[PDB]
Design a protein around this ligand. Structure first.
Ligand SMILES: [K+]
Ligand SMILES: [K+]
Ligand SMILES: [Mg+2]
Ligand SMILES: [Mg+2]
Ligand SMILES: [Mg+2]
Ligand SMILES: [Mg+2]
Ligand SMILES: [Mg+2]
Ligand SMILES: [Mg+2]
Ligand SMILES: [Mg+2]
Ligand SMILES: [Mg+2]
Ligand SMILES: [Mg+2]
Ligand SMILES: [Mg+2]
Ligand SMILES: [Mg+2]
Ligand SMILES: [Mg+2]
Ligand SMILES: [Mg+2]
Ligand SMILES: [Mg+2]
Ligand SMILES: [Mg+2]
Ligand SMILES: [Mg+2]
Ligand SMILES: [Mg+2]
Ligand SMILES: [Mg+2]
Ligand SMILES: [Mg+2]
Ligand SMILES: [Mg+2]
Ligand SMILES: [Mg+2]
Ligand SMILES: [Mg+2]
Ligand SMILES: [Mg+2]
Ligand SMILES: [Mg+2]
Ligand SMILES: [Mg+2]
Ligand SMILES: [Mg+2]
Ligand SMILES: [Mg+2]
Ligand SMILES: [Mg+2]
Ligand SMILES: [Mg+2]
Ligand SMILES: [Mg+2]
Ligand SMILES: [Mg+2]
Ligand SMILES: [Mg+2]
Ligand SMILES: [Mg+2]
Ligand SMILES: [Mg+2]
Ligand SMILES: [Mg+2]
Ligand SMILES: [Mg+2]
Ligand SMILES: [Mg+2]
Ligand SMILES: [Mg+2]
Ligand SMILES: [Mg+2]
Ligand SMILES: [Mg+2]
Ligand SMILES: [Mg+2]
Ligand SMILES: [Mg+2]
Ligand SMILES: [Mg+2]
Ligand SMILES: [Mg+2]
Ligand SMILES: [Mg+2]
Ligand SMILES: [Mg+2]
Ligand SMILES: [Mg+2]
Ligand SMILES: [Mg+2]
Ligand SMILES: [Zn+2]
Lengths: 192, 235, 57, 36, 46, 119
RNA sequence: AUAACAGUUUUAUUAACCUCUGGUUUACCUGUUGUUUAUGUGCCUUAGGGAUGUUACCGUCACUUGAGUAAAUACAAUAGCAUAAGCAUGGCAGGAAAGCUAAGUUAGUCAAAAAUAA
RNA sequence: GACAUGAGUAACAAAAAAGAGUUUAAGGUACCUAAAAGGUAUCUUAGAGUCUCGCCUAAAGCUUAUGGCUACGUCAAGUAACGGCCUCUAAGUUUAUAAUCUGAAGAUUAUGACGAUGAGAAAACUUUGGUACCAACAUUUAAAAGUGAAAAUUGUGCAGGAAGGAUAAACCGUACCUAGAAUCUGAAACAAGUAAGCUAGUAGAGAAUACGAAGGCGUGAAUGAGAUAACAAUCAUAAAGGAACUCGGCAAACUAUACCGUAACUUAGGGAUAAGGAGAGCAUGGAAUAUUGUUGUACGACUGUUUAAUUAAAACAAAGCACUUUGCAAAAAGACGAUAAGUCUAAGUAUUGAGUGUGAUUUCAUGUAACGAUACAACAGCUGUCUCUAUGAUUGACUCAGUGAAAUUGGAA
RNA sequence: UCUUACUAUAGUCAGGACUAUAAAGGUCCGAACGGGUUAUCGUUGCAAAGAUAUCCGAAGAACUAUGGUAAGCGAGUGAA
């Protein structure tokens, strides 16, 4: 009867919902990635992109508001205004990437996702795009336009850029990571 | 607020290497204290005889240790020396059929009780740092952090092997402000003589090495009268 | 209930429009070629790449 | 009164909290015994 | 309805009321024993 | 917004100090500034009106905010009124206070001829 | 004939709508009480001494404090202070846009015809 | 007895609460690899732990009882730091003996035995009756100070406060569980119930209220993830009005320190905290204290008791008062005894006991002070009771995954 | 072993206020504890008598623990 919801309530109390979002944003910085449900990964994505925006401000108020979101500031603030601030210095927003994944809990079959920091040590799209390039080179195939489009996304703002991407490809081929990969030319002849 | 230490090599004041982590030995971390550079420290403000001897009692089944200045422990010692290590793991009282004298330390100076009151302090400060701040056993040795909270509380109670290693350390000058050191400062220093009485000869082998100022004797005064015979290795 | 529901009127309620829908939004995975849901990450390559970034780095 | 009357504040053995204050034996490596 | 009439019950009052010695030692208790004994009861009391 | 059981102030020299509204005359909506009502005298001031006399009154002041056609919104600190007879002729002869400006458009020249102040 | 200015109903009901007037505001800003946690900082004196704090002992039937007796120390210190958060109805208090809303605004009834009754 | 229907529906909602990593064992899959193996990843089952968040906290913590369909390596001469067994006895029990009464069964009295919820030498080594007593209350006392016990000292009030004995180490208990997270009682894994000690600190008069150190927990998938309609429950706020609601102010809201001054009435104690004057920014700020107030009637003096689990009251009781009865010489009257001996009355004696009605006092049924979760009326305030509802919050309702009822049903297009 | 009365042996009642007392009161406010006034929910309930709030007593005719006695032709106990 009243207004629509401004955001997801996630079937929690007010205080319980503010702590759930501060914990996902704390694990995101500490671990560079988290595997949770999709509605949780989409609600923390807005709070993690606003916390990295405070890390790009030179005022003290931003340094005090960053302390009021994390749960171990003494141990995580140096990383926020250090490595992370330098990483996202030149990026105009969009510092997080939420990727849908198969259920993390098979009991409830609740749709899950992966919230990660772009251009990070655990960027799952930078590695999945490196595995595609690794297979293509190792099977004499031609990369698709979507692979070329993802290859530039994961190397435009990254510090090393292409050099760090070619090293990942080299490490995935010397390990034989693409062994047993179904060639893209035999996908139309497969049923199972 | 508490501050836990890390299992990192450090320098020792003792003459021996108490633990493999010890880097150096007999290092002066602070100028000698008032009573350290004193040939005859005295029983200034304590009863006659106090400090001449120190006893150690242990739970023969679980391994919990208690240090006492008198020949008998009371309900105070069990409360002020045994921290909470889990439900059903802190006894509610002292059961005479379980607690036995582990060892007894007697100093050469028959009236310098101030040296024993210092040895007693380092033993009680080392035991608190064994039940708490056990970072050297979290991932090595007993691996207390790889155990359940139930099994972790049982190993934290088994302070008998640790207590015998605190004796070889304290009686070798470990600690800062230990009065077992004797500095002449004419500047040569040495350790005061001591004697440890053991109810079990095999119990003195928990310390990897004992100092050269401690003499080991079997049998504690008053234990034979109780029809308790000492355990000898040679037999 | 006034009467017992017959085999006909109970079979209408149970199966008329309640047939399980076949999932048709399936695509292959670029890195390995295994079947996955559309717009979703491969579950066998996620774990393998997720574990490959934990050993060496 | 400036003293803290809760002597063992934030002090636990199961969780390896560490000593509340700095002792005279806190700068030395814990003596490791020979196991049973 | 039924009440929790056995809350706080002790097993000392169970032996004093329905025990074996409360029955062999009384004229009316010897009948209960013989009846339960003639029926085949294993639990003659308590 | 004046309803039944509402207590208002009498700002005319009629001898009434505190009246209670008993009926909104001619309408179902609650009386606002310039509306006719029937009140019951509850107090007096030390042919006056005795306590308990039922008379008609006009609302001149309302604590409820009133929006004019130009977007001006007026609010007073209390509800007041002036006692009138069923004819529409002020029982009193002089008003002591400020009345709302909505009496001008509702043809209350008689109340406005007693030189009341306006807001 | 122009130009400028001024004046041109009420009640009820139905629906829509938030420009206005208010109400609400549970992840907004500000102020603030009690208490806890983390981080930083933190007394005097000439690295030493002292104040506060710490550990052990002494002592009591037992517990706490003080003296006394030893030692360490802001290096991992006391009280205090700074920042931040938690809990106490969203802790409370003052405001508050959007959305929803009436008591608010606007509109129909309040344009019109045919065939009929007495 | 089996199998249907409701129905794959209700339910798994104590207003604590979860989040992201890590790891062990056994087993299922996919790839690697085709020498089996091993390796990488993943899932199932059964566990464990780390970091963060929150909840209880004079507990939902610890130590122990009653108890136990939880599990069997739980270890003592005694004290410090232990109970039972054992000795002694109370209320009582007695198919013990003696006497006595008695249709049988049995009952009475005395003695004996038995019977804890009580009393029991020593130990940090040990084996008469106030010259009183160990009920309640109060006071004092292990000498640096404070606090809590223990025991004793002194005292106070009346309601006048046990019994008896003394004074070289056997046998039995010892595990776990204490009810918010797997154990007791409630038919059960039940939002109920159950005994004792301890139960950080801050702040307080306090065991109030608030926070919470340690600890425990945030259930055995007996669930989890979404979404945030109607409606329901539990709440928050609210323009103007302020009981217009309603059988009825039901519910909700208001009500707010060692201070100056206090009435009628009164059993002279009270009424009485009467009333009336007052304690940097919007606020000296949260929680609790904290509740409508005042006045006047009816009934009952008062505090109490009552239909466990629909009636808490005007009913019962009550102190006070009145009346009848009881002289104790063998049985005082009264009550009890298939029915007696005999027991209570009572180790009492007409100011004793029993029975009956009344229900303090005042006036002799009636009028006041005081008191009431009694009934009723008025007055003031207060508020969503209402004009007239709106919005916000949580939990259900709704959808997905897991588990899976019931009343009901002659047969049904 | 519920419950009513009695009985023996024991325990418990934070703090404050008033009153003639240090202690003499079926005194006062209010926790523990004991009650169950009003409303709401619940009614195949968490519960075959519960939850929430509110309310009453809380040094007494009080409450609680472990035993004991008294019940079914007659009626045990009963502030009824
Ligand atoms: K007979
Ligand atoms: K009271
Ligand atoms: Mg839910
Ligand atoms: Mg809150
Ligand atoms: Mg035990
Ligand atoms: Mg019954
Ligand atoms: Mg009972
Ligand atoms: Mg007009
Ligand atoms: Mg609007
Ligand atoms: Mg707008
Ligand atoms: Mg904020
Ligand atoms: Mg907290
Ligand atoms: Mg709390
Ligand atoms: Mg506000
Ligand atoms: Mg608005
Ligand atoms: Mg028109
Ligand atoms: Mg016509
Ligand atoms: Mg249905
Ligand atoms: Mg339904
Ligand atoms: Mg459901
Ligand atoms: Mg496997
Ligand atoms: Mg409390
Ligand atoms: Mg059971
Ligand atoms: Mg024994
Ligand atoms: Mg006997
Ligand atoms: Mg006993
Ligand atoms: Mg329960
Ligand atoms: Mg409970
Ligand atoms: Mg049960
Ligand atoms: Mg527990
Ligand atoms: Mg959980
Ligand atoms: Mg209002
Ligand atoms: Mg208002
Ligand atoms: Mg009406
Ligand atoms: Mg009315
Ligand atoms: Mg009410
Ligand atoms: Mg009465
Ligand atoms: Mg009843
Ligand atoms: Mg009732
Ligand atoms: Mg009379
Ligand atoms: Mg007679
Ligand atoms: Mg009468
Ligand atoms: Mg009468
Ligand atoms: Mg009463
Ligand atoms: Mg389902
Ligand atoms: Mg009973
Ligand atoms: Mg009283
Ligand atoms: Mg009272
Ligand atoms: Mg009752
Ligand atoms: Mg219902
Ligand atoms: Zn793949």
């Amino acid at each position: 009867a009243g207004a629509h919801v401004k955001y997801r309530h996630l079937s929690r109390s007010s205080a319980h919902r503010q702590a759930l979002l501060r914990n996902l944003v704390t694990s995101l910085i500490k671990n560079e990635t988290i595997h949770t449900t999709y509605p949780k990964a989409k609600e923390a994505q807005r709070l993690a992109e606003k916390l990295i925006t405070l890390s790009k401000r030179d005022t003290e108020t931003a340094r005090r508001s960053a302390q009021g979101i994390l749960y171990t500031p003494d141990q995580l603030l140096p990383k926020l205004f250090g490595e992370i601030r330098e990483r996202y210095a030149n990026r105009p927003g969009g510092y997080t990437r939420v990727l849908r994944t198969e259920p993390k809990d098979q009991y409830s079959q609740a749709p899950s996702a992966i919230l990660e920091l772009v251009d990070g040590p655990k960027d799952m799209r930078f590695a999945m795009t490196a595995a595609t390039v690794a297979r293509d080179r190792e099977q004499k195939t031609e990369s698709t336009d979507l692979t070329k489009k993802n290859m530039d996304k994961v190397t435009r703002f990254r510090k090393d850029g292409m050099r760090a991407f070619e090293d990942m490809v080299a490490s995935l081929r010397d390990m034989k990571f693409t062994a047993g990969a179904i060639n893209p030319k035999e996908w139309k002849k497969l049923d199972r | 607020s508490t501050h836990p230490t890390t299992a990192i090599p450090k320098p020792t004041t003792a003459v021996l290497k108490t633990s493999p982590l010890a880097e150096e030995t007999a290092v002066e971390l602070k100028s000698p204290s008032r009573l350290q550079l004193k040939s005859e420290p005295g029983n200034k403000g304590n009863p006659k005889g106090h400090g001449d001897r120190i006893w150690a009692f242990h739970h023969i089944e679980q391994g919990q240790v208690i240090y006492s200045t008198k020949p008998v422990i009371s309900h105070q010692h069990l409360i002020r020396q045994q921290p909470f290590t889990g439900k059903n793991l802190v006894p509610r009282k002292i059961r005479k059929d379980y607690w036995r004298p582990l060892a007894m330390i007697e100093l050469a100076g028959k009236d310098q009780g101030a040296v024993g009151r210092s040895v007693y302090q380092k033993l009680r400060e080392f035991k608190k740092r064994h039940e708490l701040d056990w970072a050297n056993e979290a991932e090595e040795g007993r691996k207390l952090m790889h155990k359940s909270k139930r099994e972790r509380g049982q190993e934290l109670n088994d302070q008998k092997p640790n207590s015998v290693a605190d004796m070889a350390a304290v009686l070798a000058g470990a600690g800062k402000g230990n009065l077992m050191w004797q500095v002449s400062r004419l500047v040569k220093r040495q350790l005061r003589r001591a004697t440890v009485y053991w109810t079990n000869e095999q119990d003195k082998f928990h310390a990897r090495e004992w100092s050269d100022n401690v003499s080991h004797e079997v049998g504690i005064p008053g234990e034979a009268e109780k029809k308790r015979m000492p355990i000898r290795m040679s037999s | 209930p006034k009467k017992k529901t017959s085999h006909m009127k109970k079979r209408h309620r149970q199966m008329a429009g309640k047939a399980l829908k076949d999932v048709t939004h399936l695509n292959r995975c670029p890195a390995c070629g295994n079947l996955k849901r559309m717009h979703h990450l491969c579950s066998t390559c996620l774990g393998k790449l997720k574990g490959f970034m934990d050993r060496n780095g | 009164v400036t003293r803290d009357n809760s002597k063992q504040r934030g002090e636990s053995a199961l969780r390896k909290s560490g000593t509340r204050w700095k002792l005279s034996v806190s700068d030395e490596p814990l003596p490791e015994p020979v196991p049973r | 309805g039924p009440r929790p009439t056995m809350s706080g019950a002790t097993r000392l009052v169970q032996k004093r009321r329905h025990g074996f010695l409360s029955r062999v030692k009384t004229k009316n208790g010897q009948k209960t024993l013989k009846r339960r004994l003639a029926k085949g009861r294993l639990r003659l009391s308590a | 917004m004046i309803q039944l059981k509402t207590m208002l102030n009498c700002i005319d020299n009629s001898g009434a100090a505190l009246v209670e509204c008993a009926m909104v005359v001619g309408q179902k909506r609650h009386a606002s500034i310039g509306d006719r009502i029937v009140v019951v005298v509850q107090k007096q001031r030390g042919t006056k009106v005795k306590r308990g006399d039922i008379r008609h009154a006009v609302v001149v002041r309302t604590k409820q905010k009133v929006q004019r056609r130009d977007g001006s919104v007026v609010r007073f600190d209390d509800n007041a009124c002036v006692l009138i007879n069923k004819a529409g002729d002020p029982i009193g002869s002089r008003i002591n206070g400020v009345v709302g400006q909505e009496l001008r458009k509702k043809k209350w020249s008689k109340i406005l001829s007693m030189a009341p102040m306006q807001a």
